[PDB]
């Protein structure tokens, strides 16, 4: 039988997208300061 470890895979990919958005947020603040 073949059972892909799918739910973990999906949770990890969501963790990746979360880190990407955090990244964009830290940048959004750096830009803010600069424009001040």
């Amino acid at each position: 039988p073949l059972v892909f470890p799918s739910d973990e895979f999906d949770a990890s990919i969501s963790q990746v997208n979360e880190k990407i958005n955090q990244s964009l947020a830290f940048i959004r603040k750096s830009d803010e300061l600069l424009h001040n």
Binding site: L2, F4, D10, I13, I20, S23, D31, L34
Partner: protein
């Protein structure tokens, strides 16, 4: 010192754009890796 600080500010602004550009690229790459996993799971496995 004015421009010294005004040069650095401009650089940092390009650097920030660099990080955003890379993040967007990783975002796209992440969806394609998900696509590969879903293809293997939904399309390939059921037939093997």
């Amino acid at each position: 010192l004015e421009g010294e600080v005004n040069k650095i500010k401009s650089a940092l602004l390009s650097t920030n754009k660099a990080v955003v550009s890379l993040s967007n690229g990783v975002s796209v790459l992440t969806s394609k890796v998900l696509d590969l996993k879903n293809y293997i799971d939904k399309q390939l496995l059921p037939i093997v």
